[PDB]
């Protein structure tokens, strides 16, 4: 079965010219493959930017262009804007079906580095009555979107019962994540305190909660 091959990732500056390529594993691409470029942003539905190789969708900025070159389908962005930082998927029609590529992550440089803000919540009184206890560590407003989390029972590490989310992009183009530590009610009260440490770009941010 034919597969659609895209670049994994590209980086540009604001005002730069990007060219994304889309090739078939079986050979040459023509207008009979009706190449479709679909843009995906976090918290925004997919939207088709280019159809039938080169037809711009209504409202799509004219800096996006699609065409064929060297037997491959291509999408350029002439004068890229920060709002173009997104995932771009290619789809090719093979006579009887569409096949989507893996998508290209386009990064527009310029976003300044931001340290993570950490908020830690102890188990509520309601949950402790249900013989449960969970620590909620909330990490927000960090860029680039990558953090590591380590928990501490008093001053010693603890790995059992830790579940952390992948980083997700916020509306302000920064990233967020959360980490949950599950504990018995007895373990929560037998220790002096628990800590959630978030490491980002060599710096670590810490938050501490204590039984009340």
């Amino acid at each position: 079965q034919a597969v659609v091959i895209q670049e994994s990732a590209l980086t540009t500056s604001p005002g730069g010219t990007v060219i994304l390529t889309c090739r078939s594993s079986t050979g040459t691409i023509t207008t009979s493959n009706y190449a479709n470029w679909v843009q995906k942003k976090p918290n925004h539905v997919f939207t088709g930017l280019i159809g039938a190789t080169s037809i711009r969708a209504p409202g799509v900025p004219v800096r996006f262009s699609g065409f064929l070159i060297g037997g491959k389908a291509a999408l350029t962005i002439t004068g890229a804007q920060t709002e173009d930082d997104a995932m771009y998927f290619c789809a090719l029609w093979y006579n009887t079906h569409y096949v989507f590529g893996g998508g290209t992550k386009v990064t527009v440089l310029g976003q300044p580095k931001a340290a993570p803000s950490v908020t830690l919540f102890p188990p509520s009184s309601e949950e402790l009555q249900a013989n449960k206890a969970t620590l909620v560590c909330l990490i927000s407003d960090f860029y680039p979107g990558a953090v590591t989390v380590a928990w501490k029972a008093d001053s010693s590490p603890v790995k059992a019962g830790v579940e952390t989310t992948t980083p997700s992009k916020q509306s302000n183009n920064k990233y967020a994540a959360s980490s949950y530590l599950s504990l018995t009610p007895e373990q929560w009260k037998s220790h002096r305190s628990y800590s959630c440490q978030v490491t980002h770009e060599g710096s670590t941010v810490e938050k501490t909660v204590a039984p009340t």
Binding site: Y34, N36, V38, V45, F46, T47, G48, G51, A52, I55, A57, P58, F89, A91, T96, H97, Y98, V99, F100, G102, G103, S117, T119, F121, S124, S125, E126, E127, A130, T134, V136, L138, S140, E163, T164, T165, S168, Q170, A176, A177, S178, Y180, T212
Partner: protein, 213 residues
């Protein structure tokens, strides 16, 4: 232009679901329409398409004999009848045309596990645990299946400072998320904060008032 989808839900293996895509703001009968799905962590998979009058329909081989795409130009509606559902059919399903925005997507879960309503616990703030005069309170929506869950504050009137986090997938298969709202300390004793959790798959609507410990 808009494409609103509906019909997704939880269904046991071998069951059936019927998706619907309501089209508006454009000449629906002029365009081919597509069904596309994406499972969490996996790539986009084209499922099926249909021509203007509905005389031509194509399907991915994984789907032939089980799904049936149809359309009603008089009602501007696109349908996807899904029979003999398999665990591999679990994905977010999108209706789309060649140009313009896709639908918001509806979630289809094919699993032998039953739906479970979440537990909601308050995340009470503390005046001694602030940061520059701002407090932080929230709600913990724990142990539900499957996605999604909606959370609002004060019945939608409170939106400034609200931050709802994407859910974590626990090893048990249940989800948990938290929603947080940051507000000044002076509003701790004058304003009322209530989170509205809704888990439609289990028909569970819980309201929790959040106040300091």
């Amino acid at each position: 232009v808009q494409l609103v989808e509906s019909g997704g839900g939880l269904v046991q293996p071998g069951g059936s679901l019927r998706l619907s895509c309501a089209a508006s703001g454009f000449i629906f009968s002029s365009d081919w329409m597509n069904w596309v799905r994406q499972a969490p962590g996996k790539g986009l998979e084209w499922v099926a398409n249909i021509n203007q009058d509905g005389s031509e329909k194509y399907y991915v081989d994984s789907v032939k004999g089980r799904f049936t795409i149809s359309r009603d130009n008089a009602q501007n509606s696109l349908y996807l009848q899904m029979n003999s559902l398999r665990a591999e059919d679990t994905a977010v399903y999108y209706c789309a045309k060649e140009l313009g925005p896709w639908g918001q997507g509806t979630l289809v879960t094919v699993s032998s596990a039953s739906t479970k309503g979440p537990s909601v616990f308050p995340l009470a703030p503390s005046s001694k645990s602030t940061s520059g005069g701002t407090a932080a309170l929230g709600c913990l929506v724990k142990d539900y299946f499957p996605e999604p869950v909606t959370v609002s504050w004060n019945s939608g009137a409170l939106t400034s400072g609200v931050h709802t986090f994407p859910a974590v997938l626990q090893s048990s298969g249940l989800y948990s998320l938290s929603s947080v709202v940051t507000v000044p300390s002076s509003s701790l004793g004058t304003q009322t904060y209530i989170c509205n959790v809704n888990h439609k798959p289990s028909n569970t609507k819980v309201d929790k008032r959040v106040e300091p410990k």
